[PDB]
Swiss-Prot record, chain B:
Residues 27-43 have a biased composition (Basic residues). It is found in: Mitochondrion. It holds the Pfam family Ribosomal_L27A. This is Large ribosomal subunit protein uL15m. Component of the mitochondrial large ribosomal subunit (mt-LSU). Mature mammalian 55S mitochondrial ribosomes consist of a small (28S) and a large (39S) subunit. The 28S small subunit contains a 12S ribosomal RNA (12S mt-rRNA) and 30 different proteins. The 39S large subunit contains a 16S rRNA (16S mt-rRNA), a copy of mitochondrial valine transfer RNA (mt-tRNA(Val)), which plays an integral structural role, and 52 different proteins. One of its GO terms (biological process) is mitochondrial translation. InterPro entries: Ribosomal_uL15, Ribosomal_uL15/eL18, Ribosomal_uL15/eL18_sf, Ribosomal_uL15_bac-type. GO terms for molecular function: RNA binding; structural constituent of ribosome. Keywords: Mitochondrion, Ribonucleoprotein, Ribosomal protein, Transit peptide. The gene is MRPL15. It comes from Homo sapiens. Belongs to the universal ribosomal protein uL15 family.
Swiss-Prot record, chain C:
Its main location: mitochondrion. The gene is MRPL58. Disulfide bonds: none annotated. One of its GO terms (cellular component) is nucleoplasm. It is found in: Mitochondrion. Essential peptidyl-tRNA hydrolase component of the mitochondrial large ribosomal subunit. Acts as a codon-independent translation release factor that has lost all stop codon specificity and directs the termination of translation in mitochondrion, possibly in case of abortive elongation. Involved in the hydrolysis of peptidyl-tRNAs that have been prematurely terminated and thus in the recycling of stalled mitochondrial ribosomes. It comes from the Eukaryota. Down-regulated during the in vitro differentiation of HT29-D4 colon carcinoma cells. This is Large ribosomal subunit protein mL62. Component of the mitochondrial large ribosomal subunit (mt-LSU). Mature mammalian 55S mitochondrial ribosomes consist of a small (28S) and a large (39S) subunit. The 28S small subunit contains a 12S ribosomal RNA (12S mt-rRNA) and 30 different proteins. The 39S large subunit contains a 16S rRNA (16S mt-rRNA), a copy of mitochondrial valine transfer RNA (mt-tRNA(Val)), which plays an integral structural role, and 52 different proteins. It catalyses: an N-acyl-L-alpha-aminoacyl-tRNA + H2O = an N-acyl-L-amino acid + a tRNA + H(+).
UniProtKB/Swiss-Prot annotation, chain D:
This is Large ribosomal subunit protein mL49. Its main location: mitochondrion. GO terms for molecular function: structural constituent of ribosome. The lineage of its organism: Eukaryota, Metazoa, Chordata, Craniata, Vertebrata. Keywords: Mitochondrion, Ribonucleoprotein, Ribosomal protein. Ubiquitous. Disulfide bonds: none annotated. The keyword Ribonucleoprotein applies. Residues 1-22 are annotated as: Disordered. Signal peptide: none annotated. GO terms for cellular component: mitochondrial inner membrane; mitochondrial large ribosomal subunit; mitochondrial ribosome; mitochondrion. It is found in: Mitochondrion.
UniProtKB/Swiss-Prot annotation, chain F:
The lineage of its organism: Eukaryota, Metazoa, Chordata, Craniata, Vertebrata. Belongs to the bacterial ribosomal protein bL33 family. GO terms for cellular component: mitochondrial inner membrane; mitochondrial large ribosomal subunit; mitochondrion. Keywords: Mitochondrion, Ribonucleoprotein, Ribosomal protein, Transit peptide. Component of the mitochondrial large ribosomal subunit (mt-LSU). Mature mammalian 55S mitochondrial ribosomes consist of a small (28S) and a large (39S) subunit. The 28S small subunit contains a 12S ribosomal RNA (12S mt-rRNA) and 30 different proteins. The 39S large subunit contains a 16S rRNA (16S mt-rRNA), a copy of mitochondrial valine transfer RNA (mt-tRNA(Val)), which plays an integral structural role, and 52 different proteins. One of its GO terms (molecular function) is structural constituent of ribosome. It comes from the Eukaryota. GO terms for biological process: mitochondrial translation. Its main location: mitochondrion. The gene is MRPL33. This is Large ribosomal subunit protein bL33m. It is found in: Mitochondrion. The keyword Ribonucleoprotein applies.
Length: 95, 287, 152, 110, 54, 52
RNA sequence: ACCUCGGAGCAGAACCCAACCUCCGAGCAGUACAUGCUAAGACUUCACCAGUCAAAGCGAACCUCAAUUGAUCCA
């Protein structure tokens, strides 16, 4: 994944991860379901409703994506009207 | 202390007596010996022991997880979105109470940074400070503050104690200049004129409800009265105040600093200020 | 001192006064709907920190002269479930954790009650979720009323 | 960092309060951070270990340990788990007690 | 009933309310795998923005 | 044999939905719920794109 | 000769369980067009991806079938 670049000696990031996933500052990664816009004419409304969901990733997948991205994508952002602003923090979680 | 009394004995400290704190220096593990050699932690043959293991994200040939998922514009224009550092009312009250930024003078971005209540990053796309209502109650400050964004509850809370809040705009260059003025002064450049807000921020900063710095002051009292009526706590008249002159300082647009004007040059050594006559320069720096 | 071509005086030549943005329109904005805050007792007391402060506004409804006589009686009739022993109307708010917003909601409740009881020709929309059972019970109750003589 | 101004009545809004003069007659002493706060900090190493750190202790620290145990035993129902560091005069406590310890030390006048 | 409480029992009238048990949610996971984005909404107390140290 | 067609409403314009239709049968006019007007309106088959 | 999916046995009574093992099948079809929208709590083909069920609620009347299938990019 180019741990060391030939120009700066820096770690690089896989841009497919950035194009496909969103990282909340707590450490959670959000993805879209596969096939959520393919052949909707053979799918039931419940299946399509569960396909339209934004879902969380595994612990293993989260660590893999953290390895595949650089620390720039893990900083705390303060956008103006972020629809995911309230999801960047964890509440009432115990160990 | 008993420690120096102990040291009164205890032969003198030299370079032959030094020793690290236990736990700081973890011991290195070398591949020599029976336990750590003969395979050196690599296991038996295959790609593992030979080091030619496939790249991270590869899953043996099956379509990987990070490619199976459909693309979605989560971080589409992330480098162009604007960001604002939150400044809470309770943090502002704490700053005021601890001898930091002084309410007796207008409070703006440079004052907040010099008091070190906020750290603004012009790179990483921060457009200033946004005011939030975390400490709306138990907030007795009486300040004249200038921010870039503010909630209506924060506006009500500040206006409620006899203070004035206004909402201004800064382009990234003026943001850097106003956050770190001293490096700009050492740069040697004449003070530029602050730029107007973008076409989408124009209706925000020309709206008297957000206390925008480009809105007509003929609608400020009615909006202040409306906020006071919505939230109780009748609106105080600040014209009869002893600090009304200080509260009135408004810091004209295209003027990044208070007493300074665009086009001036600051000479920090041999302290003085240079003014650009040849009135073509005046026309450029005023228009 | 410095003024650019975007100075406020040139942007809005009519509003050139020094105190034009701070003068209070108390002379004209003195209608009967101002809800004099002095005559409302507002208490801020519920054990916050469940982090939701409580707004409690109470006022003697009978002696509320700022509300007209017929709307006052209509409010007393239609909100009799909120009148304490001493006759004062009680309104509370829990929507937010800011006492500012809680008081705002209480004041909005007061204004809505006043301006709803003022306009009596409002048409009550029918509901059949909770009161259908009550009305059927009342009908089958009134069905049992038939002698000739009784008093008190 | 400027010295905080002389307020007429304490505690100030936001709950700040200066240390009292003269210093309390105690076997130990707890200095204030450079910004005049109580040096009690939350700490989390793993995803589980919640601890509090009382950092700028000066004098003997075993008396402070005794006082902290006597203060937090009723609140916990058991004696608190504690580590003493004399060389770096800090006191580590298992669990989150930052606000309780800040109020307690303020009441003792540090 | 309210005037009975007014002048007969010379007491302040009590009012009751039929409440229900709080909804059951499982123990919150650090990684809620395959749960919708609204999973995090079942564990908040106040639905208002928070800014911790800022 | 059976063809998937697109059905477009008249009122609540812009809302379409795909349904399976036998090829030999005439074009469909159906009552269907239109969420942008929150009531059942007519839908007329237009622009068939599928063959199953 | 086979490569994907489902039913039965082997595999007798929670689950799982191989075989170039024994046998059947599938790559559709038919009917409404609320086959609308949301949302607790669960199951899960031993991972993941996929897949499955569903209270309450908002609206509106007062679903059969076993498999019947194809990710991403891109168009
Ligand atoms: Mg050997
Ligand atoms: Mg070998
Ligand atoms: Mg091998
Ligand atoms: Mg292949
Ligand atoms: Mg730590
Ligand atoms: Mg499973
Ligand atoms: Mg239902």
């Amino acid at each position: 994944l180019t741990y060391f670049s030939a120009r700066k000696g820096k770690r690089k990031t896989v841009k497919a991860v950035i194009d496909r996933f969103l990282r909340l500052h707590c450490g959670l990664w959000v993805r879209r379901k596969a096939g959520y816009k393919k052949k909707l004419w053979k799918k039931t409304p419940a299946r399509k409703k569960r396909l339209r969901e934004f879902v969380f990733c595994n612990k293993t997948q989260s660590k893999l994506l953290d390895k595949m991205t650089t620390s720039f994508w893990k900083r705390r952002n303060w956008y103006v009207d972020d629809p995911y602003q309230k999801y960047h923090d964890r509440t009432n979680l115990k160990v | 202390a008993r420690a120096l009394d102990l040291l009164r004995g205890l032969p003198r400290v030299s370079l032959a007596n030094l020793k690290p704190n236990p736990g700081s220096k973890k011991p290195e593990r070398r591949p020599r010996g029976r336990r750590r050699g003969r395979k050196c932690g690599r296991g038996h043959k295959g790609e593992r022991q030979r080091g030619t293991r496939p790249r991270l994200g590869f899953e043996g040939g099956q379509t990987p997880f990070y490619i199976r998922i459909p693309k979605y514009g989560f971080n589409e224009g992330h480098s162009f979105r604007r960001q604002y550092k939150p400044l809470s009312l309770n943090r502002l009250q704490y700053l005021i109470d601890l001898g930091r930024v002084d309410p007796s003078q207008p409070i703006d971005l440079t004052q907040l940074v010099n008091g070190r209540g906020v750290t603004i990053q012009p790179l990483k796309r921060d457009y200033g400070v946004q005011l939030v209502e975390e400490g709306a109650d138990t907030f007795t400050a009486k300040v004249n503050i200038e921010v870039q964004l503010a909630s209506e509850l924060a506006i009500a809370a500040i206006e409620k104690n006899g203070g004035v809040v206004t909402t201004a705009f800064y382009d990234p260059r003026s943001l850097d200049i106003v956050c770190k003025p001293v490096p700009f002064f050492l740069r040697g450049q004449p003070i530029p004129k602050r730029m107007l807000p973008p076409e989408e921020l124009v209706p925000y900063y020309t709206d008297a409800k957000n206390r925008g710095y480009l809105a007509d002051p003929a609608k400020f009292p009615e909006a202040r009265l409306e906020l006071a009526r919505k939230y109780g706590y009748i609106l105080p008249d600040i014209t009869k105040d002893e600090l009304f002159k200080m509260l009135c300082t408004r810091k004209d647009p295209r003027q990044i600093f208070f007493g300074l004007a665009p086009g001036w040059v600051v000479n920090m050594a041999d302290k003085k200020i240079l003014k650009p006559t040849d009135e073509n320069l005046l026309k450029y720096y005023t228009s | 001192e410095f003024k650019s071509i975007y100075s406020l005086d040139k942007l809005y030549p009519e509003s050139q006064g020094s105190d034009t943005a701070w003068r209070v329109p108390n002379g004209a904005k003195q209608a009967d709907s101002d809800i004099p805050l002095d005559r409302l007792t507002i208490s801020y007391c519920r054990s916050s920190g469940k982090v939701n402060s409580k707004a409690e506004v109470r006022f003697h409804l009978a002696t509320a002269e700022w509300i007209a006589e017929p709307v006052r009686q209509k409010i007393a009739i239609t909100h009799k479930n909120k009148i304490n022993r001493l006759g004062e109307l009680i309104l509370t708010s829990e929507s937010s954790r800011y006492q500012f917003r809680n008081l705002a909601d209480c004041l909005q409740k007061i204004r809505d009650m006043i301006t709803e009881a003022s306009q009596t020709p409002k048409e009550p929309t029918k509901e059949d979720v909770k009161l259908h059972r009550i009305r059927i019970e009342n009908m089958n109750r009134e069905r049992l009323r038939q002698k000739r003589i009784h008093s008190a | 960092i400027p010295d905080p101004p002389k307020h007429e009545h304490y505690p100030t809004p936001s709950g700040w309060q200066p240390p009292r003069d003269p210093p309390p007659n105690l076997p130990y002493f707890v200095r204030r951070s450079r910004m005049h706060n109580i040096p009690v900090y939350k700490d989390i190493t793993h995803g589980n270990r919640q601890m509090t750190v009382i950092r700028k202790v000066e004098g003997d620290i075993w008396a402070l340990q005794k006082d902290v145990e006597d203060f937090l035993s009723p609140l916990l129902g058991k004696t608190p788990v504690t580590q003493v560091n004399e060389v770096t005069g800090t006191l580590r406590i298992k669990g989150y007690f930052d606000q309780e310890l800040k109020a307690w030390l303020l009441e003792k006048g540090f | 009933v309210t005037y009975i409480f007014h002048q007969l029992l010379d007491m302040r009238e009590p009012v009751f309310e039929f409440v229900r048990p709080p909804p059951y949610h499982p123990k919150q996971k650090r990684f809620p795998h395959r749960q919708p984005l609204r999973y995090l909404d079942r564990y908040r107390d106040s639905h208002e923005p928070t800014y911790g140290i800022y | 044999k059976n063809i998937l067609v697109r059905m477009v409403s008249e009122a609540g314009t812009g809302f379409c939905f795909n349904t399976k239709r036998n090829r030999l049968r005439e074009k469909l006019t159906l009552l269907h719920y239109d969420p942008v007007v929150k009531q059942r309106v007519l839908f007329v088959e237009k622009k068939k794109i599928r063959s199953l």
